Amino acid sequence: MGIKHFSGLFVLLCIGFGLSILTTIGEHIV
Amino acid sequence: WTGRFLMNLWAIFCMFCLSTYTANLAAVM
Amino acid sequence: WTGRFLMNLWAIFCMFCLSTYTANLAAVMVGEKIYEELSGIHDPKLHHPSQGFRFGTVRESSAEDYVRQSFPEMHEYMRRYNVPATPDGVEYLKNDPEKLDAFIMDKALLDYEVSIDADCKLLTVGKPFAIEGYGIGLPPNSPLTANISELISQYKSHGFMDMLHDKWYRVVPC
Amino acid sequence: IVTIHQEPFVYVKPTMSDGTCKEEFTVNGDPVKKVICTGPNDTSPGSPRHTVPQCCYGFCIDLLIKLARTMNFTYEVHLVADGKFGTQERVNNSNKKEWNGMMGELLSGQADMIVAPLTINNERAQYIEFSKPFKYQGLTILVKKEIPRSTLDSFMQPFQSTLWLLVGLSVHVVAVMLYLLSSAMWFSWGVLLNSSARILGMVWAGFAMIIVASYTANLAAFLVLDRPEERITGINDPRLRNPSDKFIYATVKQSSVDIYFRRQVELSTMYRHMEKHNYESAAEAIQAVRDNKLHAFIWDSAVLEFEASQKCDLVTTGELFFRSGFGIGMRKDSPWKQNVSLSILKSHENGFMEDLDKTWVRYQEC
Amino acid sequence: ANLAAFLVLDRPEERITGINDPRLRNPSDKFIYATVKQSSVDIYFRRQVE
């Protein structure tokens, strides 16, 4: 978790959480 | 072949990825 | 419930043990693989006794005189473990070398003894130091010196020295 | 004669009970001779209490015994009331700057010889006469035998220490977000232990695997750079060159090392840094180092190396900077100028010095 | 662990220190090093018997 690696991991986690929320909403739509 | 060949390929890929990540971290540090 | 927590604790301990074992193995693999990099007489390895270096030369050759005249303490230190004759020292290298593990001496003879060593379990190391020459012993102010000197100089000029050299100076891959 | 307590050169052992000297047998079991001394038995040079005789022997004493069996001169030995190796010093009315300790105790004119490991140097040779040296040395440096504290200790000291808090916070946030129960918490914990909803679970599993791999790599990288042990290269190490507070280093006062640093130019601030904590005895500094008080004890070779090989906690690394030879002192042109030199040189050639060295300087640590 | 240790061996045996080195004093067949024919360097290396 050294500076850039930790920042990239956190950004990827946030992006994945948002994408998962969007995909769950879309799946619930249909 | 549910796991006769696909499971072996996945295990080989995972082991190679782990070894490569370990080597990359060792080289970086 | 509680069994899940116990299994999680066991798994955490297993992961920590695996990481520790990997780190220990990685550190160990970086250990002694280029051992005995003496590099010459200026290093802390050979200069002051780090509890277990056993030096040795010929008893009063040019090695002993030069060492005792330049660096005194090593005169005593070698002399407690100093062998009398050359065609003995390397033999102690075959004695599970706790007795002799260094035989400071002229590099030419050392290279020859490496060449004849078919087993090839020895490697000369350390940069050359205290370069000297050879000659022919004559009494003080004796005659004939000029004749022999010019003769050997001419033989060197024509290459007779190299003739004798490649007649006797062989090479073996080590 | 006057001698200073220095091991393994002279031993100080109190007399037993009635006044007899305890008998001792060496490694060979042969008798080891000893003589009687008088000095400040009380304590450090403070209150001068009783001065009961003690038993003395070692490396110098038997040398004097052999030196005395020839020229057959009767002798008595007594230590020095000061306890320092006779250097120069001034007073509150400094107009003479006389000699303290050993040299002054001989220079003032109530003793005959000096039998002790005193380094010969220029100004001493100017004011006093020496003989042919019988031992050569050069002063090295020592330090504690590192520290074996690396045993599952850096649980949260791998530089950045936010690993556990970050992992727990991320796991809790992911579990809360996925909560759309105790079973769910157990499943999330297993995701951290490898014990729509399906897509979110797969993404969380991939994230947990990536986090585990990254944590393993970080632990490996942290536990691959634990190799240190600077060990001090010599007096040219910049770390000791700059005077800092966490790496204090000093040397016994009023001795050869202090005069050698105080006279040679090199620099001044190093002498200033060393003068702060210069000790007052020869051996107590070793106990201070062994405790933890000092980390670099600058002192001459033979005694330092023997102490290092005595107790398996102190080792020396360096290049043996500066060189000199121990002598045997005596007054300015005493009638004993020649015979001591002749005997010492005959012994040096003969090999008796080798016998003494092997007898009283041997190895036990390894 | 062994793979990481082997991969850690980077920039090994790729640089030469100087005129004095085990590679220089005794090559066998693979480490040929040479210069240009009878130029200033040639007589210098021939001359100094040191």
XYZ file of C-alpha atoms in Angstrom:
649
model
C 0.000 0.000 0.000
C 2.791 2.394 -0.918
C 1.356 5.745 -2.031
C 0.508 5.068 -5.675
C -0.386 1.399 -5.156
C -2.720 2.172 -2.245
C -4.337 5.056 -4.135
C -4.913 2.851 -7.174
C -6.369 0.075 -5.028
C -8.762 2.479 -3.290
C -9.821 4.066 -6.592
C -10.403 0.630 -8.123
C -12.457 -0.419 -5.092
C -14.634 2.700 -5.311
C -15.114 2.292 -9.072
C -16.008 -1.367 -8.609
C -18.527 -0.522 -5.893
C -20.179 2.065 -8.133
C -20.233 -0.265 -11.136
C -21.667 -3.087 -9.015
C -24.415 -0.794 -7.707
C -25.261 0.282 -11.260
C -25.271 -3.318 -12.517
C -27.492 -4.445 -9.635
C -29.932 -1.623 -10.404
C -29.959 -2.597 -14.078
C -30.526 -6.268 -13.270
C -33.376 -5.356 -10.915
C -34.867 -3.264 -13.733
C -35.124 -6.353 -15.952
C -14.302 -31.751 -18.547
C -15.674 -29.660 -15.683
C -12.326 -29.606 -13.886
C -10.149 -32.197 -15.604
C -8.407 -29.517 -17.695
C -10.069 -26.156 -17.000
C -9.314 -26.398 -13.274
C -5.686 -27.306 -13.994
C -5.353 -24.366 -16.391
C -6.897 -22.001 -13.837
C -4.560 -23.275 -11.110
C -1.526 -22.850 -13.374
C -2.630 -19.324 -14.297
C -3.199 -18.380 -10.650
C 0.185 -19.767 -9.585
C 1.943 -17.955 -12.434
C 0.160 -14.697 -11.594
C 1.079 -14.991 -7.912
C 4.721 -15.723 -8.743
C 4.866 -12.833 -11.222
C 3.318 -10.409 -8.727
C 5.757 -11.528 -6.027
C 8.714 -11.107 -8.389
C 7.501 -7.675 -9.518
C 7.075 -6.514 -5.918
C 10.527 -7.842 -5.016
C 12.099 -6.053 -7.988
C 10.264 -2.801 -7.211
C 11.304 -2.858 -3.548
C -20.625 -18.857 14.996
C -17.688 -19.167 17.395
C -16.238 -21.958 15.264
C -16.130 -19.558 12.322
C -14.106 -17.098 14.413
C -11.737 -19.873 15.509
C -11.269 -20.988 11.897
C -10.633 -17.378 10.860
C -7.984 -17.024 13.573
C -6.355 -20.278 12.448
C -6.376 -19.100 8.824
C -4.826 -15.760 9.813
C -2.104 -17.608 11.722
C -1.515 -19.862 8.706
C -1.222 -16.865 6.372
C 1.218 -15.151 8.737
C 3.276 -18.347 8.988
C 3.342 -18.697 5.196
C 4.477 -15.091 4.761
C 7.161 -15.511 7.432
C 8.427 -18.728 5.835
C 8.555 -17.081 2.407
C 10.465 -14.091 3.791
C 12.907 -16.333 5.665
C 13.536 -18.446 2.561
C 14.066 -15.342 0.418
C 16.543 -13.928 2.939
C 18.368 -17.272 3.207
C 18.699 -17.667 -0.574
C 20.611 -14.353 -0.657
C 23.217 -15.759 1.753
C 26.737 -17.047 1.148
C 27.159 -17.697 -2.577
C 30.128 -15.408 -3.369
C 31.953 -16.149 -0.118
C 35.631 -15.295 0.418
C 35.756 -12.082 -1.617
C 38.989 -10.996 0.058
C 39.910 -8.496 -2.703
C 43.326 -7.901 -1.151
C 44.777 -6.815 2.161
C 42.785 -3.711 3.012
C 39.445 -5.153 4.223
C 37.995 -5.824 7.690
C 37.630 -9.502 6.759
C 41.347 -10.326 6.816
C 42.981 -7.390 8.603
C 41.857 -7.689 12.218
C 40.849 -11.130 13.536
C 37.114 -11.668 13.192
C 37.445 -14.861 15.246
C 38.510 -17.601 12.881
C 40.783 -16.536 10.024
C 43.875 -18.763 9.858
C 46.586 -17.182 7.714
C 49.975 -18.587 6.723
C 52.991 -18.091 4.456
C 56.441 -19.595 4.109
C 58.310 -19.154 7.358
C 60.810 -16.449 6.356
C 60.292 -15.917 2.625
C 59.815 -12.496 1.047
C 56.189 -12.741 2.190
C 57.147 -12.844 5.871
C 59.729 -10.068 5.563
C 57.407 -7.744 3.649
C 54.468 -8.393 5.980
C 56.511 -7.890 9.147
C 58.097 -4.735 7.733
C 54.799 -3.191 6.587
C 52.007 -4.379 8.918
C 53.465 -5.631 12.222
C 50.586 -7.261 14.126
C 49.928 -9.736 11.345
C 53.529 -10.922 11.709
C 52.669 -12.499 15.062
C 49.185 -13.455 13.905
C 50.423 -15.448 10.899
C 53.436 -16.784 12.771
C 51.237 -18.622 15.253
C 49.746 -20.475 12.221
C 52.653 -20.259 9.753
C 53.870 -23.332 7.852
C 57.583 -23.917 7.103
C 57.560 -25.220 3.515
C 55.493 -24.525 0.409
C 54.515 -28.042 -0.811
C 52.625 -28.556 2.435
C 50.277 -25.589 2.742
C 47.780 -26.483 0.029
C 47.759 -30.033 1.399
C 46.190 -28.670 4.580
C 43.438 -27.302 2.324
C 42.388 -30.965 2.006
C 42.214 -31.409 5.805
C 38.613 -30.161 6.224
C 40.114 -26.702 6.174
C 39.828 -25.507 9.736
C 43.630 -25.467 10.028
C 44.607 -23.645 6.818
C 42.224 -21.419 4.866
C 44.734 -18.986 3.313
C 48.198 -19.509 1.824
C 49.446 -16.019 0.880
C 52.313 -16.548 -1.581
C 53.457 -15.601 -5.086
C 50.639 -15.668 -7.630
C 52.528 -17.647 -10.291
C 52.934 -20.770 -8.160
C 49.346 -20.403 -6.940
C 48.060 -20.299 -10.519
C 50.132 -23.376 -11.328
C 48.710 -25.245 -8.339
C 45.225 -24.242 -9.480
C 46.016 -25.568 -12.962
C 47.282 -28.923 -11.686
C 44.237 -29.140 -9.382
C 42.039 -31.260 -11.636
C 39.258 -31.243 -9.032
C 39.205 -27.439 -9.488
C 37.805 -26.762 -6.004
C 39.865 -23.594 -5.416
C 39.778 -20.107 -6.930
C 42.437 -17.413 -6.621
C 40.983 -14.081 -5.495
C 42.215 -10.640 -4.481
C 43.856 -7.989 -6.623
C 47.640 -8.280 -7.073
C 49.674 -6.394 -4.481
C 53.355 -5.725 -3.774
C 54.646 -6.569 -7.240
C 58.296 -7.629 -7.311
C 60.737 -9.241 -9.731
C 63.118 -12.187 -9.838
C 66.827 -12.566 -10.468
C 70.006 -14.569 -9.988
C 71.879 -14.501 -6.690
C 75.486 -13.301 -6.784
C 78.000 -12.414 -4.057
C 78.457 -8.733 -3.161
C 80.424 -6.902 -5.863
C 81.193 -10.155 -7.676
C 82.302 -10.092 -11.335
C 80.505 -11.486 -14.423
C 77.237 -9.702 -13.526
C 77.185 -7.529 -16.656
C 77.732 -10.481 -19.001
C 74.879 -12.541 -17.545
C 72.598 -9.496 -17.339
C 73.112 -8.602 -20.998
C 72.773 -12.268 -21.988
C 69.401 -12.632 -20.274
C 68.280 -9.255 -21.644
C 69.113 -10.412 -25.178
C 67.338 -13.732 -24.594
C 64.276 -11.778 -23.457
C 64.546 -9.556 -26.541
C 64.605 -12.516 -28.936
C 61.818 -14.247 -26.997
C 63.767 -17.127 -25.435
C 62.046 -16.292 -22.147
C 58.671 -16.737 -23.851
C 59.964 -19.940 -25.462
C 60.664 -21.372 -22.016
C 57.367 -19.912 -20.775
C 55.054 -21.553 -23.297
C 57.233 -24.655 -22.979
C 56.360 -24.859 -19.270
C 53.504 -22.407 -18.552
C 50.333 -24.393 -19.223
C 46.689 -23.382 -18.797
C 43.757 -25.435 -17.496
C 40.152 -24.130 -17.467
C 39.217 -22.996 -13.952
C 57.550 -0.691 40.502
C 54.189 0.930 39.771
C 51.504 -0.739 37.641
C 47.948 -0.010 36.509
C 45.185 -2.606 36.628
C 44.755 -3.906 33.079
C 43.426 -7.326 32.022
C 44.613 -9.564 30.384
C 47.927 -7.948 31.358
C 47.752 -7.712 35.168
C 45.027 -9.134 37.408
C 43.763 -7.644 40.672
C 42.619 -10.281 43.163
C 41.945 -9.520 46.848
C 43.918 -11.373 49.489
C 41.999 -14.192 51.172
C 41.156 -13.958 54.881
C 44.368 -14.369 56.872
C 46.724 -12.896 54.287
C 47.836 -15.817 52.141
C 47.587 -15.905 48.347
C 45.152 -18.339 46.748
C 46.850 -20.950 44.583
C 45.688 -21.307 40.985
C 46.381 -23.817 38.212
C 46.335 -22.856 34.536
C 44.874 -24.729 31.560
C 47.869 -27.066 31.735
C 47.405 -27.073 35.514
C 50.920 -25.743 36.054
C 51.372 -23.177 38.848
C 50.861 -19.523 37.951
C 53.045 -17.209 40.007
C 51.805 -14.059 41.723
C 53.086 -11.293 43.988
C 51.733 -8.899 46.622
C 50.555 -5.370 45.840
C 49.505 -2.355 47.892
C 47.116 0.308 46.649
C 43.715 1.936 47.154
C 41.714 -1.190 47.956
C 38.880 0.964 49.338
C 37.094 2.176 46.196
C 37.539 4.490 43.205
C 39.991 7.335 43.957
C 37.751 9.085 46.472
C 38.169 8.453 50.189
C 41.656 6.916 50.766
C 40.792 4.120 53.188
C 42.812 1.008 54.126
C 45.362 -0.323 51.630
C 45.596 -4.034 52.480
C 47.879 -6.008 50.115
C 46.326 -7.923 47.221
C 47.469 -10.691 44.877
C 48.688 -9.666 41.421
C 49.488 -11.747 38.337
C 48.772 -11.749 34.619
C 50.837 -11.030 31.504
C 53.125 -8.219 32.672
C 53.897 -9.662 36.112
C 55.485 -12.900 34.918
C 57.349 -10.868 32.298
C 58.861 -8.894 35.175
C 59.539 -12.182 36.980
C 61.607 -13.448 34.050
C 63.247 -10.035 33.629
C 64.215 -10.191 37.315
C 65.619 -13.724 37.333
C 68.381 -12.069 35.298
C 70.213 -9.049 36.780
C 68.805 -10.380 40.116
C 67.335 -7.148 41.519
C 64.880 -7.305 44.416
C 61.532 -5.677 43.745
C 58.311 -4.446 45.338
C 55.161 -3.484 43.434
C 52.433 -0.974 44.290
C 49.613 0.480 42.200
C 48.995 4.167 41.452
C 46.806 6.349 43.653
C 45.471 8.196 40.594
C 44.598 5.436 38.128
C 45.269 7.150 34.780
C 47.970 6.658 32.163
C 49.999 9.803 32.841
C 49.018 12.480 30.310
C 49.534 16.236 30.325
C 47.273 18.459 32.402
C 47.131 22.027 33.693
C 46.040 23.457 37.047
C 44.103 26.464 38.334
C 47.450 28.315 38.445
C 48.748 26.762 35.230
C 52.382 27.760 34.804
C 54.019 24.289 34.744
C 51.392 21.827 33.421
C 52.892 18.844 35.208
C 52.268 15.114 34.755
C 49.513 13.221 36.551
C 48.977 9.512 37.098
C 51.584 6.957 36.109
C 54.236 9.132 34.467
C 54.091 11.795 37.165
C 54.236 9.107 39.845
C 57.487 8.025 38.216
C 58.614 11.479 37.070
C 58.223 13.027 40.537
C 60.914 10.621 41.735
C 59.667 7.920 44.097
C 59.427 4.889 41.769
C 61.817 2.945 39.557
C 60.095 1.330 36.554
C 56.821 1.173 34.640
C 55.490 -2.299 33.841
C 52.173 -1.753 32.067
C 50.744 -1.575 28.544
C 51.494 2.100 27.847
C 51.643 3.212 24.221
C 54.937 4.810 23.193
C 54.689 8.108 21.320
C 56.709 11.191 20.462
C 56.272 13.470 23.473
C 56.561 10.639 25.992
C 59.817 9.595 24.326
C 60.926 13.222 24.605
C 60.251 13.498 28.338
C 60.984 9.867 29.283
C 63.063 7.050 27.828
C 61.545 3.779 26.626
C 62.956 0.420 25.602
C 62.534 -1.850 22.593
C 58.801 -2.586 22.190
C 57.586 -6.131 22.808
C 54.045 -5.894 21.370
C 52.490 -4.031 18.445
C 48.904 -2.848 18.229
C 46.443 -0.502 16.553
C 43.231 0.816 18.096
C 39.932 -0.514 16.688
C 36.241 0.062 17.505
C 33.558 -2.229 18.933
C 29.783 -2.341 19.329
C 27.117 -4.629 20.793
C 26.514 -7.893 18.908
C 23.583 -6.384 16.996
C 20.066 -7.201 18.216
C 18.008 -10.366 17.495
C 14.656 -8.602 17.934
C 13.343 -9.611 14.478
C 10.999 -12.424 15.539
C 7.353 -11.715 14.634
C 7.750 -8.213 16.071
C 6.823 -5.919 13.163
C 3.136 -6.856 13.287
C 2.182 -3.228 12.573
C 5.587 -1.631 11.980
C 6.063 -2.168 8.216
C 6.671 1.557 7.588
C 3.023 2.533 6.945
C 0.935 0.993 9.734
C -2.575 1.691 8.386
C -2.841 -1.796 6.851
C -5.158 -3.361 9.439
C -7.383 -0.294 9.801
C -7.694 0.103 6.027
C -8.496 -3.591 5.529
C -11.112 -3.593 8.281
C -12.737 -0.377 7.074
C -12.878 -1.595 3.468
C -14.328 -4.963 4.505
C -16.956 -3.303 6.704
C -17.907 -0.835 3.958
C -18.218 -3.603 1.358
C -20.307 -5.745 3.714
C -22.602 -2.813 4.525
C -23.027 -1.956 0.838
C -23.782 -5.573 -0.089
C -26.350 -5.759 2.733
C -29.585 -5.397 0.756
C -27.400 -10.826 8.973
C -24.981 -13.013 10.925
C -24.688 -15.381 7.955
C -23.824 -12.456 5.675
C -21.162 -11.280 8.134
C -19.708 -14.796 8.304
C -19.628 -15.008 4.501
C -17.900 -11.619 4.298
C -15.335 -12.713 6.893
C -14.736 -15.894 4.906
C -14.181 -13.718 1.841
C -11.372 -12.156 3.889
C -10.137 -15.650 4.829
C -10.921 -17.804 1.743
C -12.856 -20.276 3.897
C -26.562 -8.317 -9.238
C -25.881 -10.187 -6.003
C -23.826 -12.824 -7.831
C -21.874 -10.187 -9.773
C -21.244 -8.210 -6.583
C -20.082 -11.373 -4.829
C -17.696 -12.245 -7.657
C -16.306 -8.697 -7.698
C -15.861 -8.783 -3.918
C -14.089 -12.145 -4.149
C -11.730 -10.777 -6.789
C -11.079 -7.682 -4.681
C -10.370 -9.814 -1.606
C -7.967 -12.016 -3.574
C -6.188 -8.939 -4.948
C -5.968 -7.429 -1.456
C -4.582 -10.674 -0.021
C -1.967 -10.902 -2.776
C -0.997 -7.250 -2.296
C -0.725 -7.709 1.474
C 1.458 -10.793 1.017
C 3.688 -8.911 -1.430
C 3.943 -5.940 0.940
C 4.828 -8.210 3.866
C 7.474 -9.944 1.750
C 8.952 -6.614 0.632
C 8.977 -5.308 4.208
C 10.518 -8.567 5.448
C 13.194 -8.560 2.749
C 14.703 -5.198 3.716
C 15.377 -5.987 7.387
C 19.070 -6.567 6.662
C 21.118 -3.797 8.330
C 24.113 -4.024 10.691
C 26.136 -1.039 9.517
C 28.853 -2.335 11.898
C 30.856 0.931 11.501
C 33.371 0.951 8.654
C 35.920 2.964 10.619
C 36.581 6.514 11.759
C 35.516 7.673 8.276
C 31.882 6.620 8.666
C 29.818 9.812 8.192
C 27.188 8.633 10.689
C 29.641 8.813 13.583
C 31.441 11.732 11.919
C 28.445 13.955 12.636
C 27.970 14.190 16.427
C 24.463 12.921 17.209
C 22.787 12.096 20.517
C 21.543 8.534 19.908
C 24.984 7.131 18.982
C 27.241 8.507 21.713
C 30.850 7.298 21.775
C 33.702 8.115 24.148
C 37.026 6.882 25.538
C 38.801 6.716 28.900
C 40.147 10.056 30.125
C 43.783 11.070 30.565
C 45.080 8.307 28.295
C 46.872 7.725 24.997
C 43.795 7.960 22.760
C 42.775 11.351 24.144
C 46.243 12.813 23.609
C 46.401 11.364 20.088
C 43.088 12.921 19.065
C 43.710 16.208 20.904
C 47.065 16.756 19.148
C 46.470 15.472 15.612
C 44.600 18.112 13.632
C 41.932 16.179 11.643
C 39.064 18.123 13.245
C 37.877 19.704 16.496
C 34.147 18.992 16.814
C 34.763 15.238 17.095
C 37.034 15.841 20.084
C 34.413 18.203 21.508
C 31.700 15.552 21.116
C 33.876 12.858 22.679
C 35.002 14.968 25.652
C 31.407 15.184 26.925
C 31.227 11.580 28.154
C 34.847 10.443 28.475
C 34.966 7.795 31.184
C 37.154 7.583 34.284
C 38.275 3.931 34.332
C 39.520 1.346 31.856
C 36.956 -1.457 32.204
C 33.743 0.163 33.478
C 33.133 1.471 29.956
C 32.885 -2.157 28.819
C 30.094 -2.740 31.336
C 28.416 0.479 30.184
C 28.533 -0.765 26.584
C 27.259 -4.212 27.578
C 24.364 -2.592 29.452
C 23.421 -0.209 26.593
C 24.985 3.087 27.672
C 27.652 3.295 24.948
C 27.767 1.944 21.401
C 31.343 2.685 20.245
C 34.310 2.273 22.606
C 37.506 3.584 20.999
C 40.377 1.716 22.656
C 43.611 0.012 21.673
C 43.737 -3.442 20.125
C 44.870 -6.231 22.436
C 42.677 -5.583 25.481
C 39.656 -4.686 23.346
C 39.915 -7.851 21.254
C 40.451 -10.083 24.286
C 37.409 -8.620 26.036
C 35.404 -9.001 22.820
C 36.338 -12.679 22.611
C 35.733 -13.103 26.355
C 32.005 -12.338 26.606
C 30.020 -13.300 23.497
C 28.223 -9.972 23.191
C 30.891 -7.570 21.862
C 32.618 -7.686 18.469
C 34.900 -5.322 16.572
C 34.789 -4.228 12.927
C 37.068 -1.722 11.238
C 40.487 -1.293 9.656
C 42.791 -0.828 12.695
C 43.574 2.835 12.152
C 46.830 4.225 13.610
C 49.586 1.934 14.907
C 52.103 1.812 17.750
C 53.892 -0.577 20.082
C 53.724 -1.247 23.814
C 56.985 -0.645 25.655
C 58.542 -0.896 29.101
C 59.224 2.456 30.735
C 61.940 3.713 33.061
C 63.571 6.916 34.259
C 65.630 9.331 32.150
C 68.962 7.525 31.645
C 68.871 5.164 34.588
C 71.848 2.807 35.033
C 69.516 0.104 33.628
C 69.487 1.346 30.028
C 71.024 -1.589 28.178
C 70.324 -4.881 29.960
C 66.534 -4.573 29.746
C 66.765 -3.952 25.996
C 69.166 -6.851 25.486
C 67.001 -9.263 27.485
C 63.775 -8.169 25.789
C 65.314 -8.581 22.325
C 66.797 -11.979 23.193
C 63.385 -13.108 24.435
C 61.691 -11.663 21.337
C 63.940 -13.688 19.040
C 63.922 -16.775 21.273
C 60.167 -17.345 21.330
C 59.433 -16.797 25.014
C 57.093 -13.975 23.978
C 55.143 -16.541 21.960
C 54.832 -18.775 25.028
C 53.543 -15.901 27.157
C 51.091 -14.796 24.460
C 49.696 -18.301 23.977
C 49.467 -18.791 27.742
C 47.624 -15.598 28.672
C 45.766 -14.645 25.447
C 43.585 -17.506 24.182
C 40.043 -17.881 22.888
C 36.921 -19.306 24.532
C 33.997 -17.621 22.762
C 34.362 -19.696 19.588
C 10.580 -18.051 -2.718
C 13.194 -19.604 -5.015
C 11.708 -17.926 -8.094
C 11.685 -14.557 -6.324
C 15.307 -15.042 -5.251
C 16.365 -16.010 -8.782
C 14.543 -13.040 -10.324
C 16.132 -10.755 -7.718
C 19.497 -11.399 -9.406
C 19.533 -8.285 -11.606
C 22.467 -6.656 -13.419
C 24.756 -9.557 -12.436
C 28.048 -10.304 -14.225
C 27.408 -7.544 -16.768
C 30.113 -5.010 -15.823
C 33.908 -5.172 -15.707
C 35.904 -3.449 -12.977
C 39.310 -2.831 -14.505
C 42.513 -4.298 -15.866
C 42.677 -6.615 -12.824
C 39.745 -9.042 -12.645
C 39.304 -12.850 -12.796
C 37.627 -12.538 -16.190
C 40.578 -10.591 -17.611
C 43.503 -12.537 -16.160
C 42.176 -15.892 -17.458
C 39.677 -16.186 -20.284
C 39.191 -19.617 -21.817
C 37.247 -19.412 -25.100
C 34.278 -17.038 -24.749
C 35.567 -13.718 -23.403
C 37.860 -12.553 -26.206
C 39.014 -8.960 -25.701
C 41.332 -7.246 -28.162
C 42.527 -3.946 -29.611
C 43.943 -2.591 -32.868
C 47.153 -3.920 -34.351
C 50.498 -2.546 -33.089
C 49.152 0.796 -31.881
C 50.063 2.800 -28.786
C 48.126 0.486 -26.453
C 49.862 -2.646 -27.764
C 53.400 -1.577 -26.894
C 52.215 -0.264 -23.528
C 50.713 -3.606 -22.535
C 53.778 -5.430 -23.869
C 56.324 -3.164 -22.179
C 55.275 -2.944 -18.528
C 56.351 -6.327 -17.166
C 54.526 -5.426 -13.943
